[model samples]
Target chain A: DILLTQSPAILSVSPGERVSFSCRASQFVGSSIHWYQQRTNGSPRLLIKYASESMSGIPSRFSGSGSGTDFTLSINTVESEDIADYYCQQSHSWPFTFGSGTNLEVKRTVAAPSVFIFPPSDEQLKSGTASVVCLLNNFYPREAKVQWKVDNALQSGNSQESVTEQDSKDSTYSLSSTLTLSKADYEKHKVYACEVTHQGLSSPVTKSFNRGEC
Target chain B: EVKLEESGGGLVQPGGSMKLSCVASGFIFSNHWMNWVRQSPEKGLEWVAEIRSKSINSATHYAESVKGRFTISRDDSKSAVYLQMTDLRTEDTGVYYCSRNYYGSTYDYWGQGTTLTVSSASTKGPSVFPLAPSSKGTAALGCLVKDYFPEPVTVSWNSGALTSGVHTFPAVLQSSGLYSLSSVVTVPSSSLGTQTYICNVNHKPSNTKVDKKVEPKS
Candidate 1:
């Protein structure tokens, strides 16, 4: 059972700074070192291998060096999205031991989306069908998900969703999610909801339709 | 642009033999080595075997755990590699992945993974676990039933069969060809009523049955 100990359990740094970390194997393991970026809720991607060889297509900024029980992974210039745990694994022997990992917490600020749902206009209601729209306003970092719920039940498919960039107010993002329902159906269910999930918020933000007769 | 996909994995009876397959594309196989790794239900990720696609004469390495029973081979013409294991056992169940090792360095590309399971004549019973309710406002309980042969099993709650609101999730990718499935009986808080719930598992294929009494709190 080979053990690998990584140094600096946590590192807090700003973007564009040179960051480096080390891993020391219990014994000599040659040049069989490999590094991976394991993102939260995402798959692990191999970045560096064989001590210092970067895989083809991997960013040049990410590089590695060291051999014989000692190894280091360095990022020439860290980027904002480089906030994820980095791990080192040695293929020197069976059981393939992996490092405890270094959590790279990039210093930055982010904004969570404010959610609101709007009812269809009176003209659309009179037309026997309504397109209820949910607006996700003022979210920072520009990535989020919107799920339309009918009467608190998730809409299985065919919900129109889109995003449009905002140049003003220093780059706040906006998105619209729409659910088409018959006027009678809206009257029957009486509610529609939009749930927005973002990196800025730990939990999902949801808002329900007021369902007023407009 | 490199891609690797795995296939040809399924249920293998005890002491049986089978070969796992992997297809590589968008890259030349002869220039790199291929690797096999697995995650068993009882163990974390483990290295199984590796073989360079340089040629048939190149060396191949296997983990000590499977050194004698496993062999790795590849065909550069097909841009693919394969592994054949003899004398499979229930302990051999796991999701097997094939990775592309660039110049013997990093695993540059990986297959989603093919699950291998060796079914047995013996039976493994289900162990019930308690689940706490979240903001969704529901209380539920889960049961684990695995490591048995013939894959099919029936679950019942209380004296009556459970119907509706029973959310079943194939919890894990599975070691055996049978998808690793578990049952979570989602009941409203009031339905729990501080009552002791009963769970019964019937593995008709393996002729195994077990019953447990669960009194959940919180």
Candidate 2:
């Protein structure tokens, strides 16, 4: 199956600040660009596609309109409710692809005498494993959970964790949760995950661990 | 935009067998395969078999293990194929339809199914009832169980149990291997209002089940 990779690994957005991200296909999907959002412990929710025709029963703030191979996901006025991970998919073919994700945060910086590389907050730390690290600075307006699992089968706890930066949402952050097993488990080729969730968002963002060993 | 329609004998006696034919038009027959699927009375679907323009193949999942009974023969000159099942049982009665795969992997399109009935006695049209006084007589009810994969189907009586007055009937087997059964029991005039009948067929191998309930009108 072909894969969809979201970049910057993660994104952080401030309240009232616009959040933007892009999804690219390795081959032509023609005009089948569709976007979806996933919240923590939730199902996938459709966002935009075929130039951002908003699906029925969706909030007005979320809109997507694009042409051909390139498309955009936008939040008109970022509210505390719109804090889940966002992705783009192509129904044009099987094994569809998705972008990594963007995590929106609250703004607090009024003055800065030094360069401030915002750090992951308390909420992000609680969702990941003990050894896992946080990626975003604003765990607020709310907390995002990045729980891990094995072989895509649901697991009760967390494992290895990592986080990345976002250029689109300045001063905000996105976090990840990871899982590690014994040499025996690795031979079994288990799966790990990073679950991001928010209220206004319809679904959860699930990133899977692909590496396998003999 | 290819289409297929099936035409055959509408009705047969309770012990008689039937042969139905399907005619196709609008597409190259050699490029696709055609098959028969039957939905037994109140039961799920069954895959009879498939016939390509080149070879004949049977569905490996049939519970009865129907082997050579079904024959798929086509005529290019007329663009038609006949599907014949030997031995007629009341159980072999239901709507028979034809389907083809045009765009999707499974059967995405279907034709209007045709209803076939096999009866023991030949009677056309409805019987008139008397307004004043009338004598009591026996009413024959036909319960058709279209597909007979998993056997030993149960036929029930609504007015009273089949054990009381109505006797359980024997099945009629056809050359194509299909089975049919009809039970004719006498009902008293006082029990006429309460007379309700039901037929349930179950084929164990496929776990297929179907039922039909009919109210008595005299």
Candidate 3:
């Protein structure tokens, strides 16, 4: 697996600050780097491809240009809404890898989040079926969004948006979601996933439930 | 200039008929016999019809593939050979050319080919494999367009001109009478995650357009 390191792990930017970040590869990864713009609670969007060409529907100010080992992802003029997480991924080899991420922030006292996909408990399990729970814990200002997919197919109708409790221990908050399946259908599929999209984070936190046994 | 050219090859409707002529010049009109052969990109070549010049009067013969519906004759002062073909099927879409024959079976001096298309009322869409961004990487993606006919199918990545190396094989004839082809392009894995490849299969005869969209792993 090739490793990509994006410098300036986190930054606070002003309005219209021409944003630029460097994505350096642990090895010679060539120009196979692609840049993505990911906002809190949203999917990552491709801004530049092959280290440089702008994708369709993307603003003209967002561009890329670099090859071989060293590369750059540039936003000629970063807007207030553009203060999102910018990531660079290397596609030159197997086990494709993405840079840790650069969180280009504006100004906020919001704390970063720590999330988890707690496994199925006895109450969540059935004699021949299963249910999985997702606990996205500890963040502030805005609550996070969560989704569950079983075997890559979206699972709906069984999940509910639960309490937004501000834990008395700290000012941070939390959210929860659940997925259930009946009729022994759990024997028909392999994996169940919990995807958490929180505030100020460059990317989502994904956790998967194994289906080999229980 | 021993020029040889063919005419009358275009869009034959199913179970339709057509006439083709091969114009010749710069050679003795009766010294060499004229032969007609058909070639399909996906199948073996075939000898469709011929005329015998060594006989006192040139007599025509037809191959069993088109036996009862093919006729060959020389006219216009021996400067041209004409063929009347009837009952062409979708499988009969191919290039028909005329060649000057010597006494030997292997003939020489062939005319530029004229291709034909037998149109159909139906179109067959394609299915995408929904996988394959090669693990070893530069991440080659192969798009296979199968069970289609009428020839000239194409596959494209999200965009073209990334094109350092893009390749497609000639259509392969299947036992079921359909033609299948495969095209491949080298795409970096990241692009595969963003806006992945979509293979568009088009058949001019049927105006068949099938776009196979392969979604990335989320």
Order the candidate numbers by lDDT, best to worst: 1, 3, 2
> Which digits, one per residue and each the tens of the lDDT, describe model 2 over residues A134-192?
12223333345555455666656434333332213443333333233334454455444
DockQ of all models, two decimals each: 0.07, 0.01, 0.01
lDDT of 3 by residue, A62-146 (tens): 8888888788877787776686787787767643456778877654357655544534333224443344546554566445778
lDDT of 3 by residue, B1-218 (tens): 67778999986688899999999998886767787867663542455777867554786767766789888988747689998888888888888878765442333456777888886533554433332342223554555454676565666655553444344545644444556555555456676666556666566556666666654332
- For model 1 the TM-score comes to 0.48
On DockQ, the leading prediction is: 1
Candidate no. 2 TM-score: 0.29
Q: lDDT per residue, candidate 1, A42-105, as tens digits?
A: 4458988788988777889999999898899999899866778887888786557677788786
Candidate 2 regions off by >4 Å? A1-214, B55-66, B101-104, B130-218
Model 3 ranges off by over 4 Å: A1-214, B10-15, B40-45, B52-55, B87-94, B103-106, B116-136, B142-148, B172-180, B190-202, B206-215
Off by over 4 Å in 1: A1-22, A29-32, A38-44, A50-87, A91-214, B41-43, B54-56, B119-218
- CA RMSD of each candidate after superposition: 17.2, 26.4, 23.3
Q: List the residue pairs that clash in candidate 3.
A: none
Docking class of 3: incorrect
What are the candidates' interface root-mean-square deviations? 15.9, 32.9, 25.6
**Per-candidate TM-score, chain A:** 0.51, 0.49, 0.50
Candidate number that wins on TM-score, 1 or 3: 1
Give each model a TM-score: 0.48, 0.29, 0.42
